Amino acid sequence: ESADLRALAKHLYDSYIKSFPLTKAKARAILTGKTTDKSPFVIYDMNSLMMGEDKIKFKHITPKEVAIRIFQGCQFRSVEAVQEITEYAKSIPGFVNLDLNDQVTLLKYGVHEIIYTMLASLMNKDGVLISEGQGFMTREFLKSLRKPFGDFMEPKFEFAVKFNALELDDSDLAIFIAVIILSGDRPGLLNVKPIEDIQDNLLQALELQLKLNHPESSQLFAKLLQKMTDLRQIVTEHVQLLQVIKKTETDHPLLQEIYKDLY
């Protein structure tokens, strides 16, 4: 069965690769200057953004204020992320054989956590990759947006730095992501047995992958599990904010229906 856990691990990595265009390896390149291919357009102050939008050209333009056009771009891209993560989750052994109600429940509450995890791979302490890699937006500029949106992006940076210090690679993350999805304590799951049975195989595969790939750091597995509560914390804070954008900010119907804050 040691031989199985190694293949569950290789299985998830391929799908992870097929499911997610912008991998951590590919991000970490763009960030360091590791390739001689392209380089990110940078967004450091109010000036830089102006010029950015022309050369960079985004998908989420909606012909508002700057800080709103960012938030919503974040949300557009997260709706994109959901479909990628929805594809990935189908590849996890057993998952599709689950009750459809549970499938939906698991994704519904899983996706925020998986987005913040993957966002860590696009960040360093100084900013974050945007627009499928082609841009870079500084942490300072994000911290300088107006009263509500100044703190928006900051908890994720705090987490990212802590998280990225574990130095995980995509193969480790592909298994970590499967674990978050198959979290058998989502509200309203109908049949928790097969969910935990699968989570149990995934943890065993994760545990083993971490040992072989990161032998130098003992209790990396435990360190990683602790970060699920960090992830979970960032989500309650994000729901805290979404409530005070509903209550204070003013917004098309079909745009707020595409970007339906699930809960």
Ligand X SMILES: Cc1c(C)n(Cc2ccc(Cl)c(OCC(=O)O)c2)c2ccc(C(=O)NCc3ccc(C(C)(C)C)cc3)cc12
Binding site per annotation, positions for rosiglitazone: 75-78, 112, 238, 259
**Binding of residue 258 to ligand X (CB under 6 A):** yes
What tokens does 24 get?
């951590």
**Binding of residue 180 to ligand X (CB under 6 A):** no
**Binding of residue 68 to ligand X (CB under 6 A):** no
Taking the complex as a whole, the smallest distance from the CB of residue 168 to ligand X amounts, in Å, to: 17
Contacted by 53, from ligand X, a second copy, none: CB < 5 to 8 Å by type: none
Query: Dihedral through CA 102, CA 116, CA 129, CA 38, nearest 10?
Result: -60
Distance CA 123, CA 138 (A): 10
Q: Is 174 exposed, middle or buried (0-12, 13-18, 19+ CB in 10 A)?
A: buried
Site string for ligand X, 86-115 (x = CB under 6 A): -------------------------xx--x
Q: Segment contacting ligand X (CB under 6 A): 10-18, 97-105, 129-137, 179-187?
A: 129-137
Q: Segment contacting a second copy (CB under 8 A): 21-29, 77-85, 138-146, 224-232?
A: 224-232
Choose, by CB under 8 A, the member of 204, 214, 241, 259 that binds a second copy.
204
Interface positions, 211-250, toward ligand X (CB under 6 A): 238
Q: Which residues contact 27 (CB under 8 A, 6 or more apart)?
A: 121, 122, 129, 133
Q: How far is CA 216 from CA 164, 219, 220, in A?
A: 16, 10, 9
Hey, which residues does 41 pair with through a beta bridge? Answer: 135
8 Å CB contact between 95 and 89: yes
**Binding of residue 130 to ligand X (CB under 6 A):** yes
Choose, by CB under 8 A, the member of 101, 191, 218, 243 that binds a second copy.
218
Choose, by CB under 8 A, the member of 22, 42, 74, 225 that binds a second copy.
225
What tokens does 222 get?
């435990």
Phi, psi of 127 (to 5 degrees): 165, -160
Amino acid (one-letter) located at 38? K
Instruction: By CB under 6 A, name the binding residues for ligand X.
Output: 70, 73-75, 77-79, 81-82, 111-112, 115, 119, 122, 128, 130-131, 137, 238, 255, 258-259, 261-262
